[PDB]
């Protein structure tokens, strides 16, 4: 689990969004596994505006923050899960690292701020849904 709070927005994995998120929907994209909903309170997270390829992510299944190198956002084939059939996921970044399904929502950060959230993984890889291209999250 996990979410990003910036301005009056909440950014979550689309597969983990709640009924309140869908009723208060701002934008979602199934191919990215992202959903953004509106909030009443101001959030404290800052989104990175950069092309960093090194950062640190939170892995709940190890209670640890791991430093990693990751690929730039790309279109990647992802196998089926209980939430989606096998498909191409867009804006996805991969790193070598541990992850399990319930690690989705863990944040990836670089020196500039929040980069993305855990969305895919297995077999020694972890995949993050990028949010840096969503410039409207800051305005
Ligand atoms: C479109 N929609 N989907 C859900 C949902 O819970 N789906 C299972 C989780 N999921 C997997 N992938 C995407 N979501 C939902 C709930 C309330 C209103 C609208 C909704
Ligand atoms: C981090 N992580 N996430 C998943 C997962 O099932 N994600 C559900 C959302 N999803 C995205 N594309 C398809 N389904 C996973 C599985 C095994 C090991 C690690 C994992
Ligand atoms: Zn950066």
UniProtKB/Swiss-Prot annotation:
Active site: 15 (for protease 2a activity), 33 (for protease 2a activity), 104 (for protease 2a activity)
Binding site for Zn(2+) 1: 50, 52, 110, 112
Signal peptide: none
Reactions this protein catalyses: Selective cleavage of Tyr-|-Gly bond in the picornavirus polyprotein
Subunit (UniProt): Homodimer.
Chain's role: Cysteine protease that cleaves viral polyprotein and specific host proteins. It is responsible for the autocatalytic cleavage between the P1 and P2 regions, which is the first cleavage occurring in the polyprotein. Also cleaves the host translation initiation factor EIF4G1, in order to shut down the capped cellular mRNA translation. Inhibits the host nucleus-cytoplasm protein and RNA trafficking by cleaving host members of the nuclear pores. Counteracts stress granule formation probably by antagonizing its assembly or promoting its dissassembly.
Protein's name in the database: Protease 2A
Organism: Coxsackievirus A16 (strain G-10)
Residues of the full protein shown: 869 to 1007 of 2193
